[PDB]
Amino acid sequence: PNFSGNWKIIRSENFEELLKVLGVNVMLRKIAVAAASKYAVEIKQEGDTFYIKVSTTVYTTEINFKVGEEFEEQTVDGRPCKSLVKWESENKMVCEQKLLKGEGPKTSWTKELTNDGELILTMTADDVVCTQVFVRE
Numbered sequence: 068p069n070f071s072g073n074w075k076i077i078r079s080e081n082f083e084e085l086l087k088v089l090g091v092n093v094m095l096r097k098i099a100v101a102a103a104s105k106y107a108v109e110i111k112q113e114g115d116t117f118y119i120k121v122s123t124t125v126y127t128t129e130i131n132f133k134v135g136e137e138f139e140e141q142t143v144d145g146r147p148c149k150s151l152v153k154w155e156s157e158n159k160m161v162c163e164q165k166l167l168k169g170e171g172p173k174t175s176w177t178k179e180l181t182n183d184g185e186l187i188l189t190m191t192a193d194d195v196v197c198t199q200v201f202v203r204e
């Protein structure tokens with residue numbers, strides 16, 4: 068697996084619907100969909116250690132984890148969570164999340180490197196799955 072690279076988004080499906088499940092009101096959902104059309108993901112992978120920087124026009128966030136080791140990040144709508152990533156196959160990993168405080172939809176994400184050289188991210192809230200596709204810059 069070489070997830071390492073600078074990835075730029077080419078497709079985003081069901082992102083508004085995901086944010087809706089997560090309780091974001093309609094005007095902000097539209098504004099967020101618009102910010103997603105631009106966004107980039109930078110990955111540095113060494114073995115099962117990952118560094119990920121996600122950036123839009125005005126905001127940037129870093130995720131650091133090792134596969135199989137609990138870490139803390141935030142859900143899509145911004146609520147702090149405990150996360151745990153496991154491999155599902157050679158080139159796909161899955162992250163399950165648990166809220167630090169309170170309750171809400173069951174969230175997760177996956178990241179896959181396809182044979183055609185695309186990165187596929189999925190983000191899930193309950194029954195709704197957002198799929199985003201990236202290519203290397």
Ligand SMILES: *C/C=C(C)/C=C/C=C(C)/C=C/C1=C(C)CCCC1(C)C
Nearest residue numbers: 099102103106121123143176178188
């Ligand atoms: C492996 C890559 C991951 C886990 C990327 C996660 C990216 C997000 C959770 C970004 C979500 C966004 C918003 C919450 C609002 C603006 C649009 C996005 C897509 C940057």
